[PDB]
Coordinates of C-alpha atoms and ligand atoms in Angstrom, one line a residue:
X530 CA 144.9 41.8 34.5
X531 CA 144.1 43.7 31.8
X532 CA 142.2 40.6 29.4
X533 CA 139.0 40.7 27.7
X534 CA 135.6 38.2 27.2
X535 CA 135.5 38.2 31.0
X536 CA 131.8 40.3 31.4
X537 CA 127.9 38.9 31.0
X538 CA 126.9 39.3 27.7
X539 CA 123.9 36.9 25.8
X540 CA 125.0 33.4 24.7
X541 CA 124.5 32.4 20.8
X542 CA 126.4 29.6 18.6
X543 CA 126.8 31.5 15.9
X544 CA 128.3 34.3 17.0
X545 CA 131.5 33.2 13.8
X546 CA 129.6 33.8 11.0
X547 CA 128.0 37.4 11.9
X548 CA 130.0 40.8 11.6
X549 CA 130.0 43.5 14.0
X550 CA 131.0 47.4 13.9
X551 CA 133.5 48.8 16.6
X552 CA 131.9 52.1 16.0
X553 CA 128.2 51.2 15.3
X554 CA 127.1 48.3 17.3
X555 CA 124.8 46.3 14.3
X556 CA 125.4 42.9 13.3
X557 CA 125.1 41.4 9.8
X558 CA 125.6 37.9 8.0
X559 CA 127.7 38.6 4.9
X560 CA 125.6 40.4 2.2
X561 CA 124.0 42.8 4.0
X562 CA 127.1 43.8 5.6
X563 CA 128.2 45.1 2.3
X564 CA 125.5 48.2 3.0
X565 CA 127.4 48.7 6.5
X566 CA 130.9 48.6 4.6
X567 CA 130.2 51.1 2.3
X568 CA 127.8 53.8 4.9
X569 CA 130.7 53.2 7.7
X570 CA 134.0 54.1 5.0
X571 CA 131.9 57.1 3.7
X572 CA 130.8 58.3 7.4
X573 CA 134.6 57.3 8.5
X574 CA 136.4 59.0 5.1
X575 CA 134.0 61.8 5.6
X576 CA 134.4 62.4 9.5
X577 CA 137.9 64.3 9.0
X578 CA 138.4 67.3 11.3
X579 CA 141.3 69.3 13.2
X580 CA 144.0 67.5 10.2
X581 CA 147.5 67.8 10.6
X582 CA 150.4 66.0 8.4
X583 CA 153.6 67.3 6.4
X584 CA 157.1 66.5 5.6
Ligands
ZN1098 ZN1 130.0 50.8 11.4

């Protein structure tokens, strides 16, 4: 199988309301994730090497 939530990891209830990164591994509530949003998209926008695309 190739599934996933199937490793040990902590336990929390609350785990719905906090955000998490796929590239930075923080986790926010909602207003301070607005800081993350903005960093992440600049470092993201920013990290663009080895570009290729025409018609
Ligand atoms: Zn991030």
């Amino acid at each position: 199988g190739s599934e996933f939530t199937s490793s040990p990891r902590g336990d929390k209830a609350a785990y719905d309301i906090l955000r998490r990164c796929s590239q930075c591994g923080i986790l926010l509530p909602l207003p301070i994730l607005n800081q993350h949003q903005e960093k992440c998209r600049w470092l993201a926008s920013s990290k663009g090497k080895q570009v290729r695309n025409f018609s």
